[PDB]
Amino acid sequence: PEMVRGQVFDVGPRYTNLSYIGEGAYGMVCSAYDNVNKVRVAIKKISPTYCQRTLREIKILLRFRHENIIGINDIIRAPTIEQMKDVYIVQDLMETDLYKLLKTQHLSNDHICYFLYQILRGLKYIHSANVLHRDLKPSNLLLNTTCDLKICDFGLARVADPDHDHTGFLTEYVATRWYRAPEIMLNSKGYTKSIDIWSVGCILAEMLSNRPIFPGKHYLDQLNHILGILGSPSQEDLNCIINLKARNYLLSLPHKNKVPWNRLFPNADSKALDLLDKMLTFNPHKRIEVEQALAHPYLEQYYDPSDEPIAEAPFKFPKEKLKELIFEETARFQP
Ligand SMILES: *CCC(=O)N1CC(O)=Nc2ccccc21
Ligand SMILES: C=CC(=O)N1CC(=O)Nc2ccccc21
C-alpha cells in the first residue's frame, strides 16, 4: 500500500500517485489519479467503532443527485465485515473551498452573486428532500477551477422536524458556532429549514468582507455578536419566544442599536444587502425561505426555477449494527 505523511492510504491499484490535500473532519484527504476514468479525484480516509455521521452522510449523498452537491464516485473497503477497517470515499477533485478562497482572495460582486446562487440552488434540492444540512459554512462549499460550487459534509444533516424543534434555553448544539442561528441559543434544536438559511446569510456576509460576521468565542457570546449587529429584538419577536428563561435573558440585556448593513458593507451591492437582511432575520418564522431567496432581485441574472431541480421524493432514515449498515450501504461499489 502507498503511504502519505507517514500514514497508510490504501486505495490502489485503481487510484495511484497520491498527494495530500488536507485534513478533513474524519481523517486524511488526498488526491489520486483514477486509472479508470483518467482524471484526478479526491479521496477521504475514514478509520474506526464507527461514527453514525459516516453512515448518515453516505446514505444521503448516495441518494442525492445534483450539480451543486458533491457526489460519491466510489467507496473502497474490504470485501467482508470481518476484514473491513478503513473506508475510503472517492469524490470529484475540487481545486479549493470557500474557506481557503476567502483567506486570500477578494471576491468580485459577480463571484459573490454566482456563488450565492449555487449555494441556494443546491440548498433548494436538499430542502425539497425534507433534509437540513445543518453545518453550512465556507469550508463545506467546494469550488473547482471555473468556480462551480458543490456543497459537502452531510454528517450533521437531519430530516426536518419542525413539530419537535423546541427546547430550553442554552441547549448544547453540535454545528459550527459562527454560523448558528440566534434561536439555537434560545429555544431551537435546529430541526427547521430556517437554520440553514441563517448559515447562508452568514456565508454571504463573509463573502462581502472576507471576515466572519459573528465570530463568537463561546456558546452565549455567539448570540451577543448577533444582537450586536441586528440590535435588540422587537416586542413582537420576543412574544414569539414562549420559553421564559430565553425571553428573560433577552429582556435582561441593555438596548442595542441595529448596525446598518450598508455601514458594515460599504462596498456591497444594495440588492445583496436587501437579501442579506432577509436571510439574517432574527425571527425564524419571518426569515426568507430558499425559493424566495432564489427569486430575489439580486439573483435575477441566474434565477430559473425550471433549471433549479428538486428531489424526486422526501428522504427518510449499537456499534456492530452500525458497522453492518455501513458495509451494506457501500456494497454497490464492490466488484
Ligand atoms: C466537505 C469537505 C470535502 O468533502 N472535501 C473534499 C474535497 O474535494 N476537498 C476537501 C479538502 C479538505 C477537506 C475536505 C475536503
Ligand atoms: C406562555 C405560553 C403562551 O403564552 N402561549 C400563547 C398562547 O396564546 N397559547 C399558547 C399555546 C401553546 C403554547 C404557548 C402558548
CA distances from 102 to 71, 158, 209, 287 (A): 24, 28, 9, 26
Q: What is the DSSP string of 181-209?
A: -HHHHHTB-S-STHHHHHHHHHHHHHHHH
23: which strand partners?
28
Q: Are strands 141-143 and 87-92 parallel, antiparallel or unpaired?
A: unpaired
How many residues can be counted in the chain? 335
Between CA 107 and CA 113 the distance in angstroms is: 10
Instruction: List residues forming the annotated binding site for ATP.
Output: 21-29, 44
19: which strand partners?
31
Place of cell 442579506: 276
Confirm whether 196 is a catalytic residue.
Answer: no
Structure determined via: X-ray
Burial profile 229-240: b = 16 or more Cβ within 10 angstroms, e = fewer: bbebbeeebbeb
Give the ligand at the shortest distance from the Cα of 140. 1
| Active-site choice (135, 153, 196, 237) | 135
Question: For ligand 1, what atom is nearest to the CA of residue 22?
Answer: 12
Q: Is 205 exposed, middle or buried (0-12, 13-18, 19+ CB in 10 A)?
A: buried
Q: Is 276 exposed, middle or buried (0-12, 13-18, 19+ CB in 10 A)?
A: buried
* C-alpha of residue 160 to centroid of ligand 2, in Å: 23
30: which strand partners?
20, 43
Of 68, 172, 46, 50, the closest CA to residue 117 belongs to: 68
Contacts of 111 (CB under 8 A, 6+ apart): 147, 207
Domains plus CATH for the chain? 1-93+318-335 (3.30.200.20), 94-317 (1.10.510.10)
Cβ–ligand 1 contact at 89 (below 6 Å): no
Cβ–ligand 1 contact at 144 (below 6 Å): no
Under 8 Å between Cβ of 53 and 47: no
Between CA 159 and CA 317 the distance in angstroms is: 8
* Cα angle for residues 53, 55, 57 (degrees, 5° grid): 70
Of 69, 261, 243, 108, the closest CA to residue 171 belongs to: 243
Among protein residues, the one whose CA lies closest to atom 3 of ligand 1: 152
Taking the CA atoms of 133, 137, 142 and 143 in sequence, report the sign of the dihedral they define.
positive
Q: What is the DSSP string of 48-99?
A: ----HHHHHHHHHHHH---TTB----EEE--SSTTT---EEEEEE--SEEHH
Under 8 Å between Cβ of 265 and 209: yes
Among protein residues, the one whose CA lies closest to atom 8 of ligand 1: 94
Place of cell 468580485: 108
Between CA 158 and CA 192 the distance in angstroms is: 10
Task: Give the three cell numbers for residue 27.
Answer: 481523517
* C-alpha of residue 243 to centroid of ligand 2, in Å: 10
- Tell me the residue type at 103: K
